[PDB]
Amino acid sequence: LSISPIFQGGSYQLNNKSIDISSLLLDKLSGESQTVVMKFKADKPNSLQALFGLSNSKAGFKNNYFSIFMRDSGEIGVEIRDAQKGINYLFSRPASLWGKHKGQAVENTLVFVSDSKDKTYTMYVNGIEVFSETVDTFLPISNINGIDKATLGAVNREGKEHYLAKGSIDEISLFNKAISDQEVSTIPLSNPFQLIFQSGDSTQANYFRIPTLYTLSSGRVLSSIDARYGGTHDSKSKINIATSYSDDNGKTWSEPIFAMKFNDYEEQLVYWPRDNKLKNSQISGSASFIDSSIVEDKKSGKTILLADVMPAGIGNNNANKADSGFKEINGHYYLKLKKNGDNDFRYTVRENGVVYNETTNKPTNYTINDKYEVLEGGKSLTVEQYSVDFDSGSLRERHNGKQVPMNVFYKDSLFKVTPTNYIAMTTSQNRGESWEQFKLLPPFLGEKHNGTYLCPGQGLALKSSNRLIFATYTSGELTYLISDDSGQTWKKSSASIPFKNATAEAQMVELRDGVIRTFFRTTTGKIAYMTSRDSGETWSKVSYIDGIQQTSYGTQVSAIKYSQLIDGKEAVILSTPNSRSGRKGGQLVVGLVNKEDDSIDWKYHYDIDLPSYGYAYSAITELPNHHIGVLFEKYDSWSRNELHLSNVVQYIDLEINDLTK
């Protein structure tokens, strides 16, 4: 840092009693710009607590103060208030903090920059920028009328301690300068987590959701994710599937690449609005991919990744449930196309990509190549790309002058697919260094049924055979997709479930050879399971796990078969929020398998962080060194208050002894 602190202090215990630092700090504040650097712990916070306050403590000036505050939800924020100036700034972001990790309080590193030159207030926690707000009328934190108290662990208002804190401030420093983003990056951190995917990386997505992890036979650990461009919204949106891998047991990760991507819309790093009027803004004319899952095939050595594919403007909410998008002729399914100007789907994509007119029974001069792009007499047709912006005060989607290959999933294509959901497949023969062009899977539930929905996370490679299984769901059932030929062909195995309209996200473990247990999200508040004892051909009725709570809408749950005995027994590890309130209270739950009846004793619960801190979708894998890697959404991804947060999908490394303590 280019300058020394005006005040520095440490080892402050905040035990619901403020610490007055007025005489040490107030007369050292000068000029209109300041930086606060604070290292602090709060593993048992109050509902709302102030970590640092500067206030006018006198009668009649209760709303003249600056504070750095946090909530027991993990939210961090500031207030900057002066009643005489008529200013009441409040800037915050949910899900910004860690509480505990491996049972010990985490030291959070907070950096707040108040910059009078740029009229901007910026907050970083744990190296992540969580807000940056420019104002028309700047209020220097010292310029609040009548400030006479500087306080740790409360704000002194009219002589009383408000917003009392429980925690500790291990170090706090203030500077009479707005330090640069570059200087900020030099401040040491004590983070319990890593980032694999992050804002500003090669994906240029500012948001991520739906993590996966899979340990490959080489020892490489692979991860896939939704790179979500238009905020954290599900499709309809612009979303690509990105991947990254680690060759050192998760200590470092490769720069992401794409496994599946569309180019109808630019890859733009956009700061999606979080205000109540605009937060529902959703990219509406882009094709997308959503919800990926990985498996490795022993025979071929291929890595196989599946994901849902959504045509332009389509998502689960508006996909046509009564149309697969294929025509069966006869025994073979051919992708249907509608040509601009036709009200009906007159075409199919036949062998060799030939576009065939169903009404005239003649091939046309158009072909669809292996990238689902349209050619006419062998030449590639193009469309103009779109970009998005909020410069007009609402979301605008507009052509940007760049030509890209015309794809049948695009809004502007001459030939367009049925507006329903599909599933696609890509393979890698180099363990994630590159991905082949995706191919659509066929329909499994007939001509007049939309795609099933891929369960995000892992597929299952049965240990003693060549069988691969990917779970998917639809209304009234799980639909397991089974391949015995390295993913060249798939058949379904349907397993009825006693819920309609469930997002029945399911993950599988092989308890022993040929015996599969599937754990899945329900609408009941409990995680369900079912068992197959014939390698997925047939499935039991549904049972429920006791000792874990979910919300009524549920959350995805990840599950693995651990390779080593725990307490002399075979073990399964589940990862899920454990809360009836929200997507919070993340846990790993270790289940010991009864060798006589395949029942599971859920003997250990490990809290990922505080019960009140967010935890949503998750990925777990046994790393080659027998550690457990967890990549998870550290926020409430259902909440309409926690939309569009950056750098909340995070990675941690745990050992079994951390879980069973």
Ligand SMILES: CC(=O)N[C@H]1[C@H]2O[C@@](C(=O)O)(C[C@@H]1O)O[C@@H]2[C@H](O)CO
């Ligand atoms: C294909 C798709 O939309 N997948 C979604 C669904 O699940 C999630 C969720 O957070 O619950 C996130 C997934 O990415 O939101 C969706 C909702 O539940 C409707 O199924």
